[PDB]
Every structure is written in C-alpha cells, then in structure tokens.
Amino acid sequence: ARWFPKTLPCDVTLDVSKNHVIVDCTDKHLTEIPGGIPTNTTNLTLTINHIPDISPASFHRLVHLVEIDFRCNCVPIRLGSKSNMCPRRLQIKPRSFSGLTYLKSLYLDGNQLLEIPQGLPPSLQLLSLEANNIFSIRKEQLTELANIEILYLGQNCYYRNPCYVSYSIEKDAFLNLTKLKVLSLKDNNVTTVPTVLPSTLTELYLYNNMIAEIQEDDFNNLNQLQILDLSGNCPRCYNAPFPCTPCKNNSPLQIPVNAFDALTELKVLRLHSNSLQHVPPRWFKNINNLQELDLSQNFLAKEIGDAKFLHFLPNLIQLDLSFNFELQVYRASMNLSQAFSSLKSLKILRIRGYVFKELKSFQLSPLHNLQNLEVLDLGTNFIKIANLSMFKQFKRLKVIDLSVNKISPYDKYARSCSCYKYGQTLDLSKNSIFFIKSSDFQHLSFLKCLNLSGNLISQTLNGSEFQPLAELRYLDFSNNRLDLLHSTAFEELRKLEVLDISSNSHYFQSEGITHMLNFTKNLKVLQKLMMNDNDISSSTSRTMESESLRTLEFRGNHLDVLWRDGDNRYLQLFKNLLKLEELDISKNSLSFLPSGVFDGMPPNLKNLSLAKNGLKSFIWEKLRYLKNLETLDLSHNQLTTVPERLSNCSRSLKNLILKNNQIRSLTKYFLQDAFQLRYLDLSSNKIQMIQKTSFPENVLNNLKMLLLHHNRFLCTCDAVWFVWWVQHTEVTIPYLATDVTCVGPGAHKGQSVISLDLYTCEL
Amino acid sequence: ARWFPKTLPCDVTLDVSKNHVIVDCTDKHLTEIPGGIPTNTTNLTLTINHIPDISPASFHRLVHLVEIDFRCNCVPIRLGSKSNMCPRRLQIKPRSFSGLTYLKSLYLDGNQLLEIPQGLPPSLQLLSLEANNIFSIRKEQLTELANIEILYLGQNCYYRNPCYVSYSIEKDAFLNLTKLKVLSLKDNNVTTVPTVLPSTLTELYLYNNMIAEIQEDDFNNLNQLQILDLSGNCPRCYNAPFPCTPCKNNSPLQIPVNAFDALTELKVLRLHSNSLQHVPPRWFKNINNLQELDLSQNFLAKEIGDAKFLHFLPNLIQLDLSFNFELQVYRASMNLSQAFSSLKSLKILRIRGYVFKELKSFQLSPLHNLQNLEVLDLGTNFIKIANLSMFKQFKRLKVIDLSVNKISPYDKYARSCSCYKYGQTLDLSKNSIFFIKSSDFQHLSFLKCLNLSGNLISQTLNGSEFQPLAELRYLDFSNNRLDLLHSTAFEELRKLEVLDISSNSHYFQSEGITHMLNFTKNLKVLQKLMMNDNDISSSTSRTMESESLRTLEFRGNHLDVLWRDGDNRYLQLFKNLLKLEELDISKNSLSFLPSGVFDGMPPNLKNLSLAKNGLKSFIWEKLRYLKNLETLDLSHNQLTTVPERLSNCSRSLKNLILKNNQIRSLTKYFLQDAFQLRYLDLSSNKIQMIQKTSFPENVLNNLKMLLLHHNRFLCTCDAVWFVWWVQHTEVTIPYLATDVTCVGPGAHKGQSVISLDLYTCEL
C-alpha cells in the first residue's frame, strides 16, 4: 500500500492545481522544526511552541515557501496562558529570510521582538508583527519593505503588553512604501498619526490608541483609503472592565471639520468609544460612498436627537449608535431625529445602550419608509411599556430585536494565539413577560419566529395563547416554567415546524401532576422538537405521536425513571413517531437500556445519540431492529465490551462513535464483513492492542475517518502488524504522532506509534 | 474520675429540679433498643431506625416514662429517603403500653400502622399517629382514649401516602373524648367533618382535605375552639407544583353564612387555598376575638376591592391575602377598599400575589392611619412604577417589603422525620434598579436599612448616591456590580454601621482597574463589613483603615494573588484596622501564608477564620504576634502537622478548630501547659493514636467540648490508656459511640471506642 513512512508530525495538504503544499504544525509543542521538510512546501505554519530561535539553516533548502506562520511561540506576560514560559525573547540571526526568494507572507505575532527583523526578501507582501515589544519605527529598518502591502504593527504597547513609552515614529517612516495598502497600529500607545502615510493606503487601523488631536494635514494625501478606524482614542472610561486612560477634562477626540476631505473612496469609518458629543456634518462632506459608520460608546444622546450629519450619508449601509446614554439620566422615550429618513440604503440599525422608559408607536416613525431596513436592534434599553402591535408596520424587516429590556404584557479584532433563516423574527427573549395573552401578539401574523427565552413564564397552555401567530414556523420557549397539563398545547400553531421548550424543568421536576407528552399529535408540520434539559421524570400519556416530527432532542432529562425495571409502560414512548430520524436521548442518567425498548423505537430512525448517559452494559444484538440507523453515538459512556460482530449487529450503521469510553481490548472479528461502515471513533479509551484478524484492508480501505488517540496503547512486539499497519496505511488518523502515544514498555514510554521500529523482533 | 462505664449509645440529660431523665437516640440506626436503660427515665426518643417491632418486654422495667417518641422508623414510600427500607410495616403486640402508668405522651408518626394501637394507659395525654395508614376511625378503638388531650391523626391519605379510600369516621367517634383539646385530621382525604366533635376542643386542623361542603350543625357545639384550619379544601389548582384534586365546576368551599355561630373564642381562622370568591360578613358575626385570618390562594381579587367583612374584625392582628390574582389579568393598580381602615389592631398585612402595574401614593390611603401596622408585604407583584418618596408617611412601620417586583428608577406544618433589628427597613431586593439617584431615596431619611440585593447595579459610586439616607445603619448591596474606583464610596453614610457589598465580583474580577479598598476610612461608626464572594484580585490602595471596624468577612476572594511570593505590598492589608476583632478570610485559595503577614494583622483580633482555603503548611510560631486570638478556625483545610507546643504557640487561644483536616498523629507535648484552652475540634481526621503525655487531666478537666469523630482510630493494644481515658472520663465527646469507630485490627473493625475491652493486653 505504502513504502514511504513519513514521520512528520505535521498535517500535510496538497493542492496540485494551486501548487500549494501546506504543512500545519498547530499546537504541536515542538522545540526544533522537524527534519526532512519536502522542498515543494509553500505554506508553513508554526503556532504556539517552544522553539528558542531561528537560524538561516531553518529555511535553507526551502525556496518555494510563500507563507511562514511563526505566531506566538513565547506569548507575552498577559496575552496567553502562563503554562508555557520561554526563558527569554525570540531572536533571529541576520539573513534568516533572504534565502526565500518566493516568500510573500510572514506572521511573527506574539514573540516579544524588540525591533523589526532585517534581511527580509523584497518579494514579501505581508508582514505582521503584532503583540511584540516594537515601540520604535525608523526609516532605515523600513527601507527593505519597499514592496510590502500589509503591515500589522499592532498591540505593541497597551495594558496587556506594556512598554511604558509612547510610540515613536520618525517623520516619513512609511512614506517610501509605495505598495503599502493595509497598516494597523492598534494598541500601540500612539500619540500622533505617523504623517506622512503612503498615498496607496486602503485600510488604516489606528484604533485603541492615545491619539488626542487630529491634524488637518493628516489624511491630506490618502485618496484611496477605504477603511479608517479611530476607535478608542479618548475613550468612554465609565464602568469599563479594562484599564483605560481617558483624556483630560473629559474632552473628545479633537477632529477638525476639514479632516476627511481627501478621503473620497472611504466606505468604513468607525469612531466607536471616542467620548464624542457632537458630529459635525462637515466631516461627511467629501465621503459620498460611506457604507459603515460606528459611533458607539460616546455621548451622542443629544446628537441622535438632532442627527444632522445623517443628511450627508445617502449610501450608508450600517449605523452603530450603541451605548450613547448619559449618566444618571433615565429617559422617558427614545428621541430619534427625522433625518433618519434620509438613510435610503440603510439595512442594519443598532441603537442599543440608549436606555429609556417607554417605546411608543410614533417614536419609530422616521424608520417607517426605509425599504432596505432589515435589522432593528433595540436590546439593552430597559424598556417598560412597548405595545407589540405597533410592529405591524415593520413587516418588510427581518430581525426585530426586543432583548433583555423589561417589556411586560475593547479589541474585538483580537486574533488570539437560529431564526434569521426562517423569515421575520421577534426576539422577545429575557424580557419581563410572565404570562401570554392572545391580544398581545395581535397584528403579528407575519411573524415566522418568536423568541421567548428566559422570560420565566409560568403558564398552563390550553391552546389559546398564540392564536394570531398563524404563520409561526419557530417558537423558542426555553428557560421558562411550562406546565404540560393539556394535550392541546400549541394546537393553534398550525404552521409550526420547530418548537423549543427546553430548560422548563420547574414543573417537570414535580411528581404526580399530569405531563401530556402527546401534545405533538395536533402539530401536522412539526419538523424539530427541542425539549432538552427539562428533567422530565413522569408522563401521564403513554406514547408520543406525530405525522411529521423528524428531529427530537431529549437530552438532560430523566429516562432512567421512565424506563425503570419492570415498568413496561413508557417503553414505546417514541414508537408512534413515524417520521423520526434524529433522536438525541443523551445525558439521561441511563445506567442500562432494558431489553425491548428498541422495539418501541421509530422505524425510520437514522441518528441516535446516547452520550454522557452512563450505560454500564449496552446490548448490541438489539440493533437489528433499527434497520435505518447510521449514526449511533455512544460517546462519553461507561461501556465495557464492544459487539461480537458488527456485520451481525447492523447492516446500515456507518458512524459508530465511542469517544471517552472504557474499552480495554477489541474483539477478533469486530469489523468482519461490515463493509457499509464509513466512520469509527475510539478516542480516549483504555485499549491495549489491536490485531489484524479484526481489521482487514477490505474494510479499512473505505473508512473516511478513524480516531484512535489519547488511549493506552502498549507498544511491545505483541502487535508488530499494527506497526506495519500504522505507518504504512493511508487511513486517516488525526493526531497520529503527538496524542496517541505508547505507555510502555519501560524505555518505550511516550513514543509515537508512527515512529515505531523494533528491530529486535525478528532477528 | 469515673468507675461506671455506661456503654449506652444515646445522649443522657438530667434535670433534677424537673425530674427529667431524657434519653435521646436520634439518628442512631439501632435495630433493637439497647439494654440497661436506667429506670428513672422519663423522656424516651427513637427517631428513624431499623427496629422491627415492639413487645411488652420493651418498657417492662420503665414505669416512670412520660414521653415515648417512636417516630418514622419505617417511613412511607414517598415521605422520606429510600435508603432505609423496612421489610414490612410496624407491629405492636397487645398490652405494650399498659405497663406505663405514668405515660403522658406518645409519638408514632410515619410507621405505617393500619389502625390505632390498643392497650394504651388512661394517663396518656398526647398521641400522634401521623403519616400512617389509618383511614378508619371507630368508637371501640377510641374508648380507651377517654383522657386524651392532643390527637394528631393527620397525613394518613394523600398524594405522598395514598390509601385510595375516603376517610371513614363513624358517628360520634370523638364525642366521648371529654378531655380532647387538639385534633388534626390534615391530609386524610376526609369528605365530611366528623360530627359530633367534643365540646372541649381548642384547636381543629382539618386542612388539606377533600371536604366540599360545611354543614350548619357542624361547629354547633364547639364554643371553646380557638384555631380552625380549613385550608386546601377545594384548592386553587392552577400552576400547583403538587398533585391536587379541585372540586367540580370550580366551586369554592361551600360554607354557610350561619356556620361560625357557636365559635366565640376563635382567634385563628385560616381559609387559605379554598378557591373562595366571596367572603360574606355573616361569617364574622359571632367571632369577635379573631386575631389571625388567612385567605391566600383564592379568587378574592374582586373581594379585596369591596372587603365588607373587614368591618367585623376590630381585633384582627394578621391578615394574609396573598396570591389572589386572576388569570390573564394584569391590573393597572391595586384596589384596596376603604374598610381596611377598620383594622385598628392590624400589625402584619401581606398582599403578595396581587400582581398589578403601578403602585401610586393614594393606593395605600386606607393604611395611612393604622397606628399598629408594622409589616407591609408587597412582594411578588411585578410593580413597574413606584415612587419611593410616597413611603415618607409610613415612618411608624418596621418592614416595607418591596421584593422581586420590577420597580425601576401545601403543608407548611410538615414536621418531617437581618435588618428587622435595626429599625425601619426598605427591602428593594431583586428589583429592576440599575442605577442609584439621589432624588429617588429622598424623603427617606428615617430609613435604618436599605436592601438592594440582586438589583445588578453597575455604578461607580463617588459619594453622592445615598445622600438623603442620613440615618442609614445597614446597607445591603449584595449581588450587584460595584466599581470601587474612588475611596469616597459610601462617604455620605455617616451613621452607617453594617455594609454588605458581597457578590460584586463582576468589576473585581477585572485586572488593572483601580480598586480602592481604603473606602472605609471615611466610615466613622462602621462596625461590620461583608465583602465576601467578590473575587478581589487586585487593589490600588495598599492598606485598609477604620476607626471602628470590628467585623470583616473576606471569604470567597483571592488573597492568594494579593499575598503572592515576593509581593510584600499587601502584607499589611488589615494592619490599620485597629478595632478589628472578627476576621473571616476563608475560601481564599490560600495555599500557604507567607511569613510576615501576621505582623500586619490587627492587634485587637480575636476571631480568625481560615476555612476551606487549602493551607498546605500553616506555621504556628507566628501566632505569638496575635496575643488576643481566641477562635482560630482552620477547618476544611489540608494541614499536615499540628504545632509543637500550644503553650509556646499562643497564650489566649481557646477555640482551636481543625475540622476536616489531614492529621495522622498528634505530638507528645501538644496540650502541655495550655491551660487557657476551652474548645478543640479534630473531626474528620486521619489520626491513628493519641497517648497520655500530650493529654493530661490538668488540661482535659477544663475543656467544654472536644470532637474526635469520623477519623481512623486504630484500636489495638498500643493505646490502652486511651481506652481507660475514653470510657472513664467525663470530657464531652459527641457521637462517642456511633461515629468514632475502630478501623482495625481485623476482627476489631467498626467497633466503638466506648465499648472497648482488650483483656488479652496484660494477662
């Protein structure tokens, strides 16, 4: 099959059409790069490791490298886990990258460098030096980057990685970079923008810095700029969960009126957390193609009432005005200006953090004509009175956020080391609704969704609550207190397809009261039912019936009491679910499955999940009754013995999952004649040996995935074929060189099975 | 010292003045009563056990018994833990109590008896047969109880202990009980009141039954009745967490108008959960001395608006009107009738469960003249708008309950087997207050308390929030998000004595922001400070200062980071607290105390708590610096070695607590010359032997308590003196015969040290 044993502990991906040989050593804890790298490699990745340094002998016989990822080998003091500490910082000998004539990208983030390395090839187009200790920019060290295009010099001096010195950039340091397009100086303690910047810049990220004043001759040459991020300069420090230094006298970022003049191709402008109080319309005079405008965490509560600058943004797509409230000011209503009607191309409008008392109908009148408006975020506003019927005008919308408000009837780009698909959505989750009336949801027949998660509604539904919701296809009733006393629950939701009544264990924990689990009989088009984490311990109805239910999640419940010894009542609980194909009966404290319960299983079942249950002895001969089962899931269980013969067990099972099990040895005809298998998991086990008579190539040649890591393989001369099978077969085994180790014998401890060579076996 | 070794495993209490010898065998798991009971015994108690039966030979030589407690030896199927199952029910041979001429009380609850035992002495005054299977009452079995006074025949037939048959009571079964005063027939599935009842009844508990109609000739002879409990008859079954059977057509308990006529001395009348809709004033025509009236869980929402019957209760003390709301009815205001002004002697008024929208000022106008009104409960009402200034008229009150409402700026007698002491209290806990204004608490200077627990207030207090609270002596700010950025927090609370800022770990978990822990310097009369469970990990201020702080609870925090290795900054964190006497620095993940931190301890410290910390090695010689320490608490720790000599350790330590420790052997001069000791704990340890040279009688004679149970005592001939010391010394050792056992050797496993006799030691 294979006579080329490659002991490389890194993943290899081949793309002949793209000429890409990707070697991936992510999270491999290597101290030195492995020997024998194929010379056709193009992409090279080395994440968090323990590699001390780099020498020119590292990339000596690799010229075709086009991407080198050396990110975060020695993470700084506060940016990563302190379980992997380097003795010192990273050092690079001179001319360590000059031999890479085809290099085009380099990632050196989080390695505690003092200055920019020298000797880089002129073909380099990307260079990222984030999370380093480079707080000084000069021209002589940038002369070699005359052909760079993307430069990430961010996260160099701030509270996570301090340097105690303001960012020093000499005059015209980036001027001679005629090919530079992206420049990110985020979290660098920058005092002034490094003028002059190259005129070919397209993305400028100067956010989360200490820039206090902007000059009129700052962006005077940037005519091709498209993204300008000045967020966090003079930030809003009140109740900030991060160390922030505000400006003196609580002054905002001093931006002149004639500042965004040369910016003509600007499409994204984020001024989030700048302590701004006024937004002059002169800023938006020359930027005609502005699409995204972030103005969050400011003091624009009085500006939103006027909002004159909105008259200069006819092509605005997004508008973030979150958390603009005043201190000790509880407003009675939201004061949206009429100029909001000038945003013709507006799609998303998030006005969170604008806390007020009552949301009336005519308060959203400027938004009554935005034909392109889809999302309307109004969460975290602590609204008290809000008649939902007023939303009968926003039918063309897609998301109506009515979040944690109490209606009643820093660096988000940190690259560290639902209902929107069904239609109209009313997200009333985490509100102060404690009972459901039919008149409250009136004039809301167009709703395809209704999220009532976390409202803590204690109500006995008899089939008269969600009456106006005729077109409802998804109802989220999680984190409440549902009382299933009548089988007529959710009977008026004719077009209901998905029902989530999870986390309603309050009334289900009680013993003796009626629990009609046959409430799905009146649901004719119900496709998915999520009732997990409900602690369902009893049920008056004996069976569950449905003409269309295909998915059922019954995890975190008590089937161990329903299938108790001698209690033959609830054995056929899911037998009448004809169209059921996806069962998720897991975490149900099931210590054993009583013989006969599989006879009360849906005949069309395909997906069975029995994870985190506690099965002490799961029988296998009863799987013949499930002639359509394909994805049996027995992960995180306490099984002891694997089946006798998988061929006699099932004819359609192909996705056996036995993760985190307790198995000490496989059988000797396990995979005999089980050709239909295509997926097997045996991770985190206690097995000792696996022979050949149970693993022939007729069955191994078709398996797509096979996980045999984190176990107790004893690598002695007892399973020599396994050796000849582990390093000479192309079956996909992930983590085959670092996680699956050898616990013995003696000097053979911790050895990888891929590099096994016992010459003293057949001398 | 003592030559009478009593191997009785039950506690003995002697009262010579009362002539009471109380033998207590609570939770002792005995199979047969022990032999050798002293004949002077009067009180005898046997709780949950495994005793099969009783024979006349049990109380043969005990005549002076006046109280026999045989409760709950074989608990029914659902009333107790199923870990102690009896093979059958309890049986009593005839004439098992006739030999007790001085018997006056008998408790036979929860023993699954079928009928009332016969042969009881005529001197019996109390007889309780609760939680049994006695669902039939006859006259021939009650003829022997002609001198009984208290009869508890409750909990005989209901959902916890079913019998499937209505309670059968023959005509005039209790008539000949001329001395009967208390009769409780609760939870017995009674259909009709057992007329006729003895005219000398004073307390009648017929609650939680299935009585549907009351007759006019039912209480016609009860003229000395004082307590009448008819709660749960035709109950309110909506959203009930217990199996309840309501009456047909949703009808209330049919009580005639001329029903409470003969009742003249009635003081307590509870009609809770009767589905009542009207309360006729004719019911309260003859009962002039009614003090307590319970009317909870009814449909009196329209009756509270009228409340005519309140004109007939001039001596009413309590009035419970909780949970009288209507279904699918969210009221806009609380409609209290004017007749509430007729309750001159009213003290407590709980109107919970009366959910409405807004609580205005003039809604409580009838209560504006109740001079005796103290408690005003208004929790669980979901109030939205409620101006607190309107409470400037209820200054004479004591408790103003403003519970889980959202204001913004079955059988409770089941005998199973703060701020009210400081003055005026405003309990605004678990409300929807997210920020504190000075104008909100205006006109509330009389407040001695303010509970703001669970409001989740994210605010940076600078000393201007609680300004009108000049007389505030207690502030509960738990379960919030406090930002201690300024040392001027709570500076305006001049008369503040207790401050609870616990469970505010949100902003304290953040690293880098300022945490001014010296905010107690401006508090001149602060006596107690509770800041536990705050995860305090950093502090800008180095020390904490206070002229008056005496108690400080600092548990559930991170002192393991504040006292890190080499970090000598926060060593003297509590040194400036001069008057500090009670320190509770526990659960702080402290793996070791760095040497020198005790030098930064308050000199006046008396109470130190280091529980659940994780101390791997706690030094003892450093305790000489604490010359006032008396209650050192080292429970639930991982210590290994006890101090060398307690005399050289401390001169005032007297309450050593080493519960749940890991100690394998004591020293040989531990308690030498440590005369001041008066309290020692060594429970849940791993010790093996304790000799005499460390435990002399000069020090053992004064110790009040000494706990040495749940450990690994090896009871071999190695510590014979210990034997002669354990059963011949009167030092108080609780659980000396059941919990402290012997783990060896061999045949001597599980033996009690109190019954140790090794004759083969010195043959």
Ligand SMILES: O=C1[C@@H]2C[C@@H]3C[C@H]1C[C@@](C(=O)N1CCN(c4ccc([N+](=O)[O-])c5ncccc45)CC1)(C3)C2
């Ligand atoms: O628990 C909670 C957290 C974590 C999240 C959920 C959640 C609410 C949350 C929050 O952002 N908010 C708290 C309440 N907010 C405010 C705070 C202080 C002041 N203030 O100092 O005057 C105010 N004055 C006027 C109006 C609002 C004020 C604004 C809304 C966000 C804190």
Ligand SMILES: O=C1[C@@H]2C[C@@H]3C[C@H]1C[C@@](C(=O)N1CCN(c4ccc([N+](=O)[O-])c5ncccc45)CC1)(C3)C2
């Ligand atoms: O989570 C929670 C729990 C556990 C406690 C805290 C808490 C509130 C709580 C509660 O007792 N309540 C829920 C809300 N309550 C109600 C429910 C149903 C109906 N209904 O079926 O029409 C109503 N119709 C009108 C008015 C109120 C109604 C009454 C107040 C009590 C349930």
